[PDB]
Amino acid sequence: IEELVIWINGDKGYNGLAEVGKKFEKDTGIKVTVEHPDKLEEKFPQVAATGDGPDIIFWAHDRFGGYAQSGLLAEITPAAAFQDKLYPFTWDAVRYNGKLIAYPIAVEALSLIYNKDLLPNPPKTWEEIPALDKELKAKGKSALMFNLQEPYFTWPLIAADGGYAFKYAAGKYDIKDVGVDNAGAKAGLTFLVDLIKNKHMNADTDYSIAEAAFNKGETAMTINGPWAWSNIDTSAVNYGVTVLPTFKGQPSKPFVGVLSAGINAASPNKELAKEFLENYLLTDEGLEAVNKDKPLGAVALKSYEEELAKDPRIAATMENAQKGEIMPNIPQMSAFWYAVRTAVINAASGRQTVDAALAAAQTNAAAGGPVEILPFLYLGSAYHASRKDMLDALGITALINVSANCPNHFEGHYQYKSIPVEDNHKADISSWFNEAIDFIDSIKNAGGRVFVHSQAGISRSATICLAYLMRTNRVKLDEAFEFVKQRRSIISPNFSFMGQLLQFESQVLA
Amino acid sequence: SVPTNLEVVAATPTSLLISWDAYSSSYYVYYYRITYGETGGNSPVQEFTVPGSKSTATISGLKPGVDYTITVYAGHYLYGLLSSPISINYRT
């Protein structure tokens, strides 16, 4: 509670931020205390859901979307002037549903890292790479090794000619508009898959293999971000950091992570918070104090980034950032990571063509439809619960809303039953089983149809369906589970929910 | 970082439905890799992956009455496969 307490992770320059916080006090009187709690990003939503947390939270923007989806952050109101002191692409990283929710501070992205002794003139284009590797292989070396397992590393190439994760426009992401199987993504993944099938790269290279091969001088280039610079410094490689290669004449598009500071919406110093960040933190003076403690990398303040860019490594980070795509802060990003990962493995190994693999990934990452469990019982996501015509076309007359923050979007048009549980181990979801089972039977007897939903339609809403099949058929959990899973393959109640379902099993069979 | 509890929740003579406490892994985690093999056996383990949003998986085609070592690894969206996996021994 109280009246400014600032949370930052310990990896960073919190002492230097303490300084810009004494220099605050000697100007305001009001005190700022900078604590760096352990498991910080996990503790914040636990404690700010009630209150007694910090006023200002610092973290990568991608997790701030989950925070804002829970309302835990206040809509910052920066002067139209102050926004021009930051690079314009950074403001796109700190919005949810259109509203600003944080101030951008620092920026990271992958770059091309090359061995100055093996390769003083690194190639500017992906297309140059096969010739260069043909030359280096005759000397026992290779041109390029980087992590091929994670889509985060392969996507900059796949995106260059037109691929994208989720379309972004007017401050919002459209989770139906996935750019995984368009012509641009096919061409980049075809180039990638060709580098592997022509043995210029190996399908098995992961983060470790790549990082060791480069720091031992076995390979002329790798791809990696600033977190990796410390290990190369330790080694005997004279290295450079530069702009990623182009593909078909267009830049590589790495994902961009924006270190950010958010305001607790459950805090009164919302003005004292805006005061400290807008006018004492993001100044050349302010960031330098933080920078001197532990470096920020590339920064979002134009004035101070000009200074740091004297380090060509930081200049390369910012340049790759400005050509990249902001990392989507929406929960659907997880299914995207996994879907593309499968596509790259299956295309790189010949199990699938590039076209079949990207097409299946498109389907996995893009939103689908509700699923019929029983004629009167459907299962699906929060997205679906906002498409009235689509539910009307299915004959849905009632919804079970298993969430803590999802509105009933069409009250008065459908009967709503709320089950307000989070998807975590603490949540007593089985104490709602009876009430939810009666609602479904009630609607069924009146000739209607129930749509049961939770954020992803994976854990909370599936658990409600499984419990219904169990009490209503007097069958075991593993039979209910097999039934739903064959209709909606992604369902997965969380570990505590599987336990609560098993307890429920022995009650309904007693 | 990595999950901390791993159990069998259903079983047939040739198959196991396992569950792990995924909620304890950070948001950085985008898949889990499951390995299984005869405990004390010679053969390399078999393995598959599942999405980071899963807390459940089916292991099938097992021999009846055999002790298996079952391991769950976390997968990070940047580094990939992480260390300190969780494992149990369980007999079909």
Do β-strands A377-381 and A450-454 pair in parallel, antiparallel, or remain unpaired?
parallel
- Count other C-beta atoms under 10 Å from residue A350's C-beta: 11
Contacts of A446 (CB under 8 A, 6+ apart): none
On whether any CB of chain A is under 8 Å from the CB of B56, the answer is: yes
DSSP letter assigned to residue A201: S
Paired tokens of B25: 């892994």
- Per the DSSP assignment, residues forming a β-bridge with B29 are B76
* C-alpha closest to that of A323 among A89, A62, A83: A89
On whether any CB of chain B is under 8 Å from the CB of A334, the answer is: yes
Q: Are the C-beta atoms of A178 and A362 separated by less than 8 Å?
A: yes
Q: Give the experimental resolution in Å.
A: 2.5
What SS3 class is residue B92? coil
Paired tokens of A285: 């003076």
- Per the DSSP assignment, residues forming a β-bridge with A247 are A250
Paired tokens of A450: 């129930």
Question: End-to-end distance of chain B based on CA atoms, in angstroms?
Answer: 29
Name the amino acid, one letter, at A81: A
Q: Are the C-beta atoms of B31 and B49 separated by less than 8 Å?
A: yes
On whether any CB of chain A is under 8 Å from the CB of B1, the answer is: no
Name the amino acid, one letter, at A326: I
Q: Are the C-beta atoms of A309 and A301 separated by less than 8 Å?
A: no
Handedness of CA A357, A178, B82, A204 (dihedral sign): positive
Paired tokens of A206: 């992961």
Taking each helix axis from N to C end, the angle separating A183-197 and A333-348, rounded to the nearest 10 degrees, works out to: 40
Handedness of CA A317, A321, A324, A325 (dihedral sign): positive
Distance CA A259, CA A476 (A): 47
The domain that holds A423 is classified in CATH as: 3.90.190.10
Does B20 sit within 8 Å of A150, measured CB to CB? Answer: no
Q: State the smallest CA–CA distance between residue B38 and chain A in angstroms.
A: 24
Paired tokens of B42: 């010679």
Q: Are the C-beta atoms of A425 and B23 separated by less than 8 Å?
A: yes
Paired tokens of A492: 């997965």
Looking at chain A, the residues that come just before a C–N gap of over 2.5 A are 3
DSSP letter assigned to residue A128: G
Q: Are the C-beta atoms of A83 and A278 separated by less than 8 Å?
A: no
Paired tokens of A483: 């039934």
With b for 16 or more beta-carbon neighbours within 10 A and e for fewer, the A356-379 pattern comes to ebbbbbbebbbbeebbebbebbbb
Of A341, A424, A498, the CB nearest to B56: A498
Give burial (CB, 10 Å; 0-12/13-18/19+) of A446: exposed
Paired tokens of A428: 């007593």
E strand segments, chain B: 6-12, 15-20, 29-38, 46-51, 56-59, 67-76, 80-81, 86-91
Distance CA A2, CA A487 (A): 50
Q: Are the C-beta atoms of A226 and A232 separated by less than 8 Å?
A: no
Paired tokens of A338: 């996994």
Contacts of A145 (CB under 8 A, 6+ apart): A201, A202, A205, A209, A210, A213, A214, A218, A219, A221, A222
Cα→Cα distances A251→A153, A224, A238, A321, Å: 15, 16, 25, 11
Please report the DSSP string for A26-67 in residue order.
Answer: HHHS---EEE--TTHHHHHHHHHTTS-S-SEEEEEHHHHHHH
Q: Are the C-beta atoms of B35 and B70 separated by less than 8 Å?
A: yes
Distance CA A33, CA A51 (A): 17
> Apex CA A116: angle with CA A114 and CA A118, to 5°?
90
Q: Are the C-beta atoms of A109 and A322 separated by less than 8 Å?
A: no
B1-92 under CATH 2.60.40.10, yes or no = yes
Q: Are the C-beta atoms of B15 and B56 separated by less than 8 Å?
A: no
Residues, chain B, total? 92
Give the technique used to solve this structure: X-ray
Please report the DSSP string for A436-454 in residue order.
Answer: HHHHHHHHHHTT--EEEEE
Cα→Cα distances A402→A369, A385, A399, Å: 18, 11, 9
Of B22, B51, B76, the CB nearest to A495: B22
Distance CA A119, CA A139 (A): 13
DSSP letter assigned to residue A148: -
> Apex CA A21: angle with CA A15 and CA A22, to 5°?
95
Chain B interface test: which of A477, A492, A506 (most B C-beta within 10 Å): A492
On whether any CB of chain A is under 8 Å from the CB of B27, the answer is: yes
* C-alpha closest to that of A244 among A336, A317, A138: A317
- Give every strand in the sheet of A415-418, ordered side by side: A371-374, A377-381, A450-454, A398-401, A415-418
Q: Are the C-beta atoms of A65 and A330 separated by less than 8 Å?
A: yes
Q: Using a CB-CB distance cutoff of 8 angstroms, which residues of chain A are in contact with residue B25?
A: none
On whether any CB of chain B is under 8 Å from the CB of A45, the answer is: no
Handedness of CA B41, B44, B46, B49 (dihedral sign): positive
Q: Are the C-beta atoms of A291 and A310 separated by less than 8 Å?
A: no
Of A66, A337, A492, the CB nearest to B56: A492
Q: Are the C-beta atoms of A245 and A125 separated by less than 8 Å?
A: yes
DSSP letter assigned to residue A260: E
Rg (CA), chain A: 26
Name the amino acid, one letter, at A115: N
Paired tokens of A356: 């079949």
Of B9, B52, B80, the CB nearest to A149: B80
Q: State the smallest CA–CA distance between residue B84 and chain A in angstroms.
A: 16
Q: What domain range includes position A453?
A: 371-509
Q: Are the C-beta atoms of A335 and B51 separated by less than 8 Å?
A: yes
Name the amino acid, one letter, at B34: I
- Tokens 């089972």 belong to A437
Q: Which helix (H) or strand (E) holds A143?
A: strand A142-144
B40: left (phi over 0), alpha (psi -120 to 50) or beta: left
**Per-domain boundaries in chain B:** 1-92
Distance CA A362, CA A350 (A): 19
Contacts of B82 (CB under 8 A, 6+ apart): B1, B2, B29, B73, B74, B75, B76
Does A206 sit within 8 Å of B81, measured CB to CB? Answer: yes
Cα→Cα distances A482→A309, A379, B16, B56, B72, Å: 57, 15, 13, 12, 22
Handedness of CA A196, A202, A203, A206 (dihedral sign): negative
Give burial (CB, 10 Å; 0-12/13-18/19+) of B83: exposed
Name the amino acid, one letter, at A374: L
On whether any CB of chain B is under 8 Å from the CB of A335, the answer is: yes
Give burial (CB, 10 Å; 0-12/13-18/19+) of A410: middle
Q: State the smallest CA–CA distance between residue A149 and chain B in angstroms.
A: 7
A262: left (phi over 0), alpha (psi -120 to 50) or beta: beta
Paired tokens of A257: 């992570």
Distance CA A208, CA A145 (A): 11
The distance of Cα A411 from the centroid of its chain, to the nearest Å, equals 32
DSSP letter assigned to residue A384: G
Q: Are the C-beta atoms of A384 and A461 separated by less than 8 Å?
A: no
Distance CA A61, CA A314 (A): 20
B69: left (phi over 0), alpha (psi -120 to 50) or beta: beta
Q: Using a CB-CB distance cutoff of 8 angstroms, which residues of chain B are in contact with residue A476?
A: 10
Name the amino acid, one letter, at B89: N
Paired tokens of A26: 């000697």
**SS3 annotation, A273-335:** HHHHHHHHHCCHHHHHHHHHHCCCCEECEHHHHHHHCCCHHHHHHHHHHHHCEECCCCCCHHH
Do β-strands B56-59 and B15-20 pair in parallel, antiparallel, or remain unpaired?
antiparallel
DSSP letter assigned to residue B27: T
Distance CA A358, CA B43 (A): 34
Residues, chain A, total? 510
Rg (CA), chain B: 13
The distance of Cα A43 from the centroid of its chain, to the nearest Å, equals 18
